[PDB]
Design a binder for these strands. Structure first.
Length: 197
DNA sequence: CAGCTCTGTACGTGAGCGATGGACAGCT
DNA sequence: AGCTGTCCATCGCTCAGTACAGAGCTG
């Protein structure tokens, strides 16, 4: 058998969770789908190799140096960026999650965003915004788009911004290069909000 | 018919793991 | 010269959401 987790079983990782990294007065909260096996293993956000997050964060200029998963706790203080996931349960991919889990996640998430009130709630995955939009805004569009959404988190000024998942499982944006446009537009939106305020 | 939701399926890239075998140094 | 074992370059295999077609349902 192939040992991908230094002798730790996949069964053990499936029982692990990934802590939120949230504070008040954040500019951005990156909302993932759920922990993958490596994030559950490490206890940090978006570790490699099958994930473009840290590469895109650097390539877009959101970080001035190339960071990695071990730097995740430094992001609120240094960059005004926090982290959560729609679903707590660890799985190898998003396809293993049920509709009920996603809708439970959505309820807990809107409550968290209403508490921390970041300037921008970033959905790192179209699939989770599809569910969130229907559940929270009661809206289901034929052609859901990426980028800035025309809805704020209820009872807050928090914007919703959607990006294709940073997971390299997605063949439609095969490289970190193919997703960086969305991170650049995220930086532009952040800089623009900090201009008026 | 015509919309809608639900399920099944196919899809590009770059990286860790395990297998392979050529290059080569240490020994006699 | 002949043998043997390690190193390590390199390769194949596997892995880390989204769009879309077609079935089933319903207005």
């Amino acid at each position: 058998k192939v040992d991908r987790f230094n002798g730790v079983s996949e069964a053990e990782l499936l029982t692990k969770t990934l802590p939120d990294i949230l504070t008040f007065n954040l500019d951005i909260v990156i909302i993932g789908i759920n922990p993958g096996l490596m994030a559950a293993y490490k206890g940090h956000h978006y570790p490699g190799p099958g994930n473009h997050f840290w590469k895109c964060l650097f390539m877009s200029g959101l970080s001035e140096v190339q960071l990695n998963h071990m730097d995740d706790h430094t992001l609120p203080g240094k960059y005004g960026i926090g982290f959560t996931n729609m679903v707590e349960r660890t799985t190898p991919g998003s396809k293993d999650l049920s509709s009920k889990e996603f809708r439970e996640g959505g309820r807990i998430l809107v409550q968290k965003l209403q508490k921390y009130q970041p300037r921008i709630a970033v959905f790192n995955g179209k699939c989770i915004y599809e569910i969130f939009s229907k559940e929270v805004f009661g809206v289901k569009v034929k052609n859901l788009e990426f980028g800035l959404q025309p809805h704020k988190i209820p009872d807050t000024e928090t914007l919703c911004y959607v990006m294709p998942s940073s997971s390299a499982r997605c063949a439609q944006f095969p490289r970190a290069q193919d997703k960086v446009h969305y991170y650049i537009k995220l930086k532009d939106l952040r800089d623009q909000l900090k201009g008026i305020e």
